[PDB]
């Protein structure tokens, strides 16, 4: 089917430039235009521009001077590049494809790339177990989790048992500590009687820092 | 640039009721409006094109109407999988612009939280910091108080809360309160207690532990 896959989230320092790659499949770049939209706290959803089937570009008015869109048809890649980023350019960037080659009704989206504009530095998280116990069992249900602490910037991805465990998972929204680093917990509830037999692993990935940790969580 | 005004900011309804989203444009745009759904951690999902036209794979309970400047996105019998934000988009005038979105929250019966507490791990303590986590699981509505006590001293300002978005299956929330101490402080005390107040509890629930066991 039709898919658009974007490169990973990252930090860009103020005044520097943002580069995102959209790799498409299920269609040919010679037949469809690819648009770029972003989502920011200040401006909400905001259409940025488009590169059309034939290579022409259009840029929304406030970005004509610092935006540039290119593509390699053979490699099915679209390259987004924006110059001199400031803090209010922190946003989720998307590539999109419309239903028809010429239109703007966006039926297909990339997964988004959260870009943080900050002078700070990237920092991988430490991962600590939230171990089940009696203080965390209620009527045959045990709760367990992973404390994903002191990372920057957002996002971090957390799954359980490599994707196989999804029921009862709550990954909490990150909170920004006074140190300027984020922290979150991911929890899951499971049958207490399975704590003896089953293995529970939170898979942590902090793509901005290339930090992948698998934390086994055991009763203490 | 056409200004699209969505109202209200938040819509709260009960499962099975009807619901309408308003999108008003700053000048006539014909029927050149599209609607999108966005779920927690998702990308937008095209619901309607050109005010009223169906989209492949979209539940039939979604419909849209309107022309000129006043537009409506309707869900005739809402489900909990509909918890999301909803945006309109106009493209009668370049450049295409989007409204600011209406949030859709769901009502349900009161559900008391299940409370769990987690001491700091010995792994964290080696770093010289102590996080104590209190989990309030699968409750409704969203309002809850967590009160931390260390050897009967009330803790203030040294905790942080996080609340999940509403669950798409059972419409509940879960909340985490993290209390952060230094290792030295943590080692200096014994009884760590999380007291939880919620509309679904007839009296506060306290989960506590003594350092060690």
């Amino acid at each position: 089917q039709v898919q658009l896959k974007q490169s990973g989230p990252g930090l860009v320092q103020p005044s520097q430039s943002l580069s995102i790659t959209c790799t498409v499949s299920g269609f040919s770049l010679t037949n469809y235009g690819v648009h770029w939209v972003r989502q920011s706290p200040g401006k909400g959803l905001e259409w940025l521009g488009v590169i059309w089937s034939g290579g022409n570009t259009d840029y929304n008015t406030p970005f004509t001077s610092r935006l540039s869109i290119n593509k390699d048809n053979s490699k099915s890649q679209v390259f987004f590049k924006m110059n001199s980023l400031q803090s209010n350019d922190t946003a989720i960037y998307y590539c999109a494809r419309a239903l028809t080659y010429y239109d703007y009704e966006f039926a297909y989206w990339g997964q988004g790339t959260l870009v943080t504009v900050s002078a700070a530095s990237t920092k991988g998280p430490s991962v600590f177990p939230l171990a089940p116990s009696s203080k965390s069992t209620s009527g045959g249900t045990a709760a367990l989790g992973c404390l994903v602490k002191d990372y920057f910037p957002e996002p971090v991805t957390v799954s359980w048992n490599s994707g196989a465990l999804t029921s009862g998972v709550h990954t909490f929204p990150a909170v920004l500590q006074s140190s300027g680093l984020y922290s979150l917990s991911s929890v899951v509830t499971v049958p207490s009687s399975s704590l003896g037999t089953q293995t529970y692993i939170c898979n942590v990935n902090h793509k901005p820092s290339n930090t992948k940790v698998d934390k086994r969580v055991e009763p203490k | 640039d056409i200004l699209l005004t969505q109202s209200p900011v938040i819509l709260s309804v009960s499962p099975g009721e009807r619901v309408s989203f308003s999108c008003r444009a700053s000048q006539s745009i014909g029927t050149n409006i599209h609607w999108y759904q966005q779920r927690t951690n998702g990308s937008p999902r095209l619901l309607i094109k050109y005010a009223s036209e169906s989209i492949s794979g979209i539940p039939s309970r979604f419909s849209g109407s309107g022309s000129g400047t006043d537009f409506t996105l309707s869900i005739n019998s809402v489900e909990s999988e509909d918890i999301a934000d909803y945006y309109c988009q106009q493209n009668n005038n370049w450049p295409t612009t989007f409204g600011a979105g209406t949030k859709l929250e769901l009502k349900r019966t009161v559900a008391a939280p299940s409370v769990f507490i987690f001491p700091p791990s010995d792994e964290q303590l080696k770093s010289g910091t102590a996080s104590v986590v209190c989990l309030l699981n699968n409750f409704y509505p969203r309002e809850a108080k967590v009160q931390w006590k260390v050897d009967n001293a009330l803790q203030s300002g040294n905790s942080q809360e996080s609340v999940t978005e509403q669950d798409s299956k059972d419409s509940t929330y879960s909340l985490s309160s993290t209390l952060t101490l230094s290792k030295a402080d943590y080692e200096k005390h014994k009884v760590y207690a999380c007291e939880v107040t919620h509309q679904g509890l007839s009296s506060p629930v306290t989960k506590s532990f003594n350092r060690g066991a």
């Binding site: 989502q39 909400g44 946003a91 929204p173 | 966005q38 951690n41 999301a84 934000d85 949030k103």
Partner: peptide, 12 residues
């Protein structure tokens, strides 16, 4: 009313 980049959901 504003979008939250952590959750991609509108918060106030």
């Amino acid at each position: 009313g504003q979008q939250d980049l952590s959750t991609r959901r509108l918060k106030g």
